[model samples]
Target: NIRLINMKVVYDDVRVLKDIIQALARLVDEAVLKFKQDSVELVALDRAHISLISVNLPREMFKEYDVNDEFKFGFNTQYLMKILKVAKRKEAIEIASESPDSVIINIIGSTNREFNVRNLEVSEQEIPEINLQFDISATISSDGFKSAISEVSTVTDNVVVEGHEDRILIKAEVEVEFGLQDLEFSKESKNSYSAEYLDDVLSLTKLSDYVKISFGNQKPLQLFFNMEGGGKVTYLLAPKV
Candidate 1:
């Protein structure tokens, strides 16, 4: 029989963790972080149900990870981000959950600072099991993707993505082409998605150098961002109909 639940994770960099929280906060107000023995995961669907986000941070990402049993800690993303913003770049952040009601955050550096954030009652949101066979998959620079979307956003809310034999085209009012890095496609595949959601999630690129994008005709768009230490942030946006 299990009597206690405890989870403590210490990450070396604050900037990466801050960026992650900012990206998640952009999509949902409240987030539930699920901690397992090997990894920490968070899955959230936007209030409008137009997008889904999944974040997976492996044990390797943390300098010190002590998790005895699987447990979940839920909190307000905005509130958490505000506290996280106070941390400096060189400081290490530690998150520990001792009780069921609150989680403790410690910033270790020149001066030790601690903050206790109350855990909110976040219900377990059902994350759809998506098994999609993308018609076109391409890896491109994260900065290139962000630039393409920003250019397209000025003209229209819906951004059109077309994958051709050699290059991928992003179009709305104007068009931008990106040379594929690791490209895979059988034929020309095209889809459109909301620029707002793409912009919000692509902010995660601050933590990754490249993003792998895949989609089918009129299907959901998948943007995969690889973190520095084996962590990943994935976003699935439904096509704009």
Candidate 2:
């Protein structure tokens, strides 16, 4: 047994953790989570490598945090979600690990049960370090963006975003029996993104009230979701050039 030895990290509620899993799992099959001395971080890339997702949760967010050393483990996102999703009635969660090869998760609430997932030997991929500057950036409603993306997806596989000084427009042009649909926002930017990829990232809106987007024509679009508390999930999607 991997003894926690008064070193377990606990969460007051499991809802936020579940929501994060659902959204992040949509972008990649497996992910490497780093348990640093002061925080937990997840960095992953989609299969096509056209999109990347980064997540960070500070130590203060945990009900109980006791980390003395750095540790990294890789696991299937879907497999973990299977455990988190059923935590509807789970009031709290306790996680512990003595090594990177496995992790122990215990769901606490009306009834208690333990779940374990063997970590995978995944060589972390090098995420290119680059600083991108966008011509325009806007903070918009998450619900509005989700609605617009859904509507545009019905007409085409992609959507073009045209940015103005004060408002943002999401528009789509179809070829056969197709019409144009646009969603206007208070802020603006111009770029094209894959509807599939955009939908996957928007899944985080379940917990985020708004999303900040930054982009330029023919450039990658950066989307930021402010999660519950202070944690954040960011996605960068290369323009559909």
Instruction: Give the residue spans of candidate 1 off by over 4 A.
Output: 1-5
**Candidate 2's error at 174, in angstroms?**
9.5
TM-score of 1: 0.94
The digit string of per-residue lDDT tens for model 1 on 84-203 reads 887886788888887868888888878778998887788776676555888888899999998888889988998999988788889994989985788988768888999888878766
Q: Residue 178 of candidate 1: its Cα lDDT?
A: 86
Colliding residue pairs in candidate 1: none
lDDT of 2: 0.73
lDDT on C-alpha atoms for all candidate structures: 0.84, 0.73
Candidate 2 lDDT over 1-241, as tens digits, reads: 3355424688876777776777678877888877776788888877788888888888888988877666666778898888776665647887778566778887876776788868777666768442477777677777877777888888877778777765576778632111122223343456688988887866676668778767887778888788766887788889886
TM-score of each: 0.94, 0.86
